[PDB]
């Protein structure tokens, strides 16, 4: 009955508690299979950790784990690409509730498959089967698309920015809880039992969506699935329609959103893997503080977003948000000490106030009956951003490690010079 915000909380808790556990099991099984009994992290760096000599077997197991994560993520992304673009456009024609019930069920099934693989110490290729099965029903991306569309169907033009911000603040709060609860359950007496919370969270999400969610499509027509008009419903969303030159703005905004979330996704990973480097050498608690402060920008940019709107338009708010990201990443990439790193986290407090604005403006452009299609395409873009961010940034960091550590953050900050320019050029051009 109440609303859709709890669904995203419960669904993001699943990802946050799932990805580290899944890769930890990958480490365990792949290492033990190759006769390697050592730490299940990557190679360390500095602070008297060894001699610097390469660990040929540890590097082999690390590469195998990365390759398997790549395989399962890529397979999941393709099945999700072919599924969400068919389940979104349909959602805006039958109701948001079924298209939110289905992916939660898929995630519960995926968590159950993962549990069954861990308890039986099964092969690691079988983890691909669970991800593929969940992808068919629409992955976590379809949950995101359904939630965002459901919000965009219950808010004016002059409110979608704030409503989307509220939803993404719930997303960030779920992420922070997942990360800081994993940092104490996964680490302490964990890696198997904490995965029960993933199944519990997904079961709760499905139950809340089915029996406690109130649909937002005020008129749900009757439409058949496997129609081909849900794939045509994004081609005749981006290419032919909207003829009053509102077609360029869609592409430019989509590109800006792509770049923005790519950088966000890459920099989170490099945060966690770079905090414990050579000149910083952070303890176990300081890393938890860093993760909490990284995920606290979600709910602290919301306060500014609502506060900034009273004086500046909905674009310049995102311009200042991008400036805050740029400043934070620049001062993090030069953070050769822990006061500097924490200041770097602190400056990024209006950091994730830009993404909400972008998707809200994307929604304000499409008709009232096409938010399903729009957010299906945006969810596909976000999945591709996940993949590319992981690949590019995890390949960049080791290369610029003995040359200038922190160039990943510097280059991420150079990337956001493009979204800021794009959004500013669009906003300047409307007014003239």
């Amino acid at each position, epitope marked *: 009955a109440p609303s859709v915000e709890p669904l995203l909380f419960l669904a993001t808790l699943a990802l946050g508690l799932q990805v580290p556990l899944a890769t930890q099991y990958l480490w365990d099984r792949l290492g*033990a299979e190759r006769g390697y009994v050592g730490p299940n*992290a990557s190679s360390p760096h500095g602070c008297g950790n*060894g001699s610097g000599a390469v660990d040929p077997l*540890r590097e082999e197991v690390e590469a195998l784990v990365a390759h398997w994560n790549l395989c399962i993520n890529l397979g999941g992304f393709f099945v999700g690409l072919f599924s969400v673009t068919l389940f979104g456009p349909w959602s805006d024609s039958v109701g948001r509730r079924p298209v939110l019930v289905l992916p939660a069920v898929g995630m519960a099934v995926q968590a159950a498959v993962y549990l069954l693989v861990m308890y039986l110490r099964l092969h690691v290729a079988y983890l691909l089967l669970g991800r593929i099965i969940s992808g068919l029903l629409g992955d976590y991306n379809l949950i995101l698309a359904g939630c965002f569309a459901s919000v965009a169907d219950s808010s004016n033009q002059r409110t979608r920015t704030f409503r989307v911000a509220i939803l993404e603040a719930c997303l960030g709060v779920a992420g922070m809880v997942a990360s800081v609860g994993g940092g104490q359950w996964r680490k302490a007496e964990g890696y198997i039992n904490p995965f029960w919370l993933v199944l519990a969270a997904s079961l709760a999400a499905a139950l809340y969506a089915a029996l406690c969610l109130q649909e937002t499509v005020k008129q749900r027509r009757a439409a058949k699935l496997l129609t081909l008009q849900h794939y045509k419903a994004v081609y005749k969303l981006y290419t032919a329609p909207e003829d009053l030159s509102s077609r360029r703005k869609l592409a430019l905004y989509s590109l800006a959103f792509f770049l923005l979330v790519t950088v966000h996704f890459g920099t989170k990973d490099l945060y*966690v893997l770079y905090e414990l480097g050579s000149p910083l050498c952070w303890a176990s608690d300081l890393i938890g503080y860093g993760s909490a402060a990284s995920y606290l920008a979600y709910l602290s940019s919301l306060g500014g977003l609502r506060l900034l709107q009273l004086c500046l338009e909905d674009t310049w708010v995102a311009e200042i948000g991008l400036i805050s990201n740029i400043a934070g990443l620049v001062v993090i990439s030069l953070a050769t000490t822990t006061p500097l790193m924490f200041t770097g986290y602190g400056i990024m407090f209006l950091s994730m106030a830009a993404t909400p604005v972008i998707r809200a403006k994307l929604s304000k452009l499409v008709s009232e009956t096409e938010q399903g299609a729009l957010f299906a395409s945006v969810a596909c873009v976000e999945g591709l951003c996940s993949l590319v961010a992981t690949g590019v940034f995890n390949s960049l960091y080791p290369s610029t490690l003995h040359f200038m550590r922190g160039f990943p953050f510097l280059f991420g900050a150079i990337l956001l010079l493009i979204p800021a320019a794009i959004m500013g050029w669009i906003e300047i051009q409307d007014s003239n």
Partner: nanobody
Amino acid sequence: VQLVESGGGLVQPGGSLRLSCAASGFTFSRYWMYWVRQAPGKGPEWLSHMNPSGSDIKYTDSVKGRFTISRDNAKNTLYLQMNSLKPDDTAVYYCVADRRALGSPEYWGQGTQVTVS
């Protein structure tokens, strides 16, 4: 945080060297404990490891049935006795300490010299 080891030395082939890892600076009841060596002119050769309790003991087949890890948490020392030592064993044995998690640091010990001959 510091881990200090003292069991090395010049022992004959077939001796019974007994390393201790007198750890402190942290809890040690919540930390996985490893062992590793850097043979002369070569790379790390991870030997064994043991979960915070003493139930998940794993070895490597080069040292299976010949190295016997142990820990005593009321004293905070990690052992690894070495029966039937061989000239291929001489190395600098380190004593790692991880939480068995990705976002956790590992604390390499100083490591002592075993000079089997």
